[PDB]
């Protein structure tokens, strides 16, 4: 019900003929939903449920995509979880000595979320897993699991109705 | 110091004094991000900035990344009428998130020093046809930012002042 409402809002808000960054070939603009009053609340609530079995006190990722996902999780009802942001180094709550959830809005390569995992690691945080709003079946899952980390997402590529 | 009026004085109560506590503890020698990205302080920030700006008409809230962002999302997530958010990039789209064109907008900032960051976000919004109804900050530090904001004919309001920070 929530997941269905979220998926509808994402197709509606974020699946927007286009010359890409690539030079190739709709495109997905996840920030239209992560910065939307309702979608962002659903994101916060579903991401908590998605990672309930994990142990972490602090959530964040690489600016900019990850930031409203992290704060949406911090604000959504439930137990206290603080937030941070990785610049391009760490801002917001202390991750040093901490259990950290790394988030992304949607990964392509996983580089961004990884840059974020390593920036956390290089200052002493322990990363427990990576969670994203939308997986797009692009290899990010695989790249992330190739460093010992669990990867999960709320929605998959099917939910985008492509 | 160039002391400016702190409109947040008038909404005294438990929420304001708790937040002032949290900002002294987490942020003071001053790192506001520790409060803006903190679960309780951010939630109070959302509640209070909504209250501070209740007589203002806007449907979207945001400012210049990074400082503005957790203040904007805090407002968006707090209880009450639906308010969406956006983020002005330092460079690029330039404005990311919800649509601001033809909208009434609140620009926010965690704390301003010169006012340059907030005025940058304001101008970026105007340039894409958004209407900025004011600027609100969490903490004013009597630095002259409020005057620079007001010199363009914008309204300005803050929740806390220097005195709330010790
Ligand atoms: O790094 P990858 O796993 O390939 O992911 C592609 C990235 O593209 C977007 O961020 P973008 O590069 O647009 O930067 P922004 O977050 O500053 O907009 C999105 O948030 C992804 O993190
Ligand atoms: O003189 P002003 O333009 O009013 O600037 C005041 C800003 O300075 C600080 O951030 P900082 O610029 O250090 O970091 P950021 O740009 O990454 O938010 C603070 O968070 C305010 O946003």
Author numbering:
A (entry chain A): 4 to 19, 22 to 30, 33 to 95, 105 to 178
B (entry chain B): -9 to 18, 34 to 97, 104 to 177
According to the publication:
Herein, we report the X-ray crystal structures of MtOPRT (coded by the rv0382c gene) in complex with PRPP, inorganic phosphate and an exogenous Fe(III) dicitrate molecule (ferric dicitrate, FDC) at 2.25 Å, 1.90 Å and 2.40 Å resolution, respectively. In all the structures herein described, both monomers composing the functional homodimeric unit are related by a 2-fold axis, with a solvent excluded surface between monomers of 1045 Å2 (13% of each subunit surface).
A PRPP molecule could be unambiguously identified in the active site in both monomers of the binary complex with the substrate crystallized in absence of Mg2+. Refinement statistics gave good correlation coefficient score (CC) for the PRPP molecule (CC = 0.89). The ribose hydroxyl groups of the PRPP form hydrogen bonds interactions with Glu120 and Asp121.
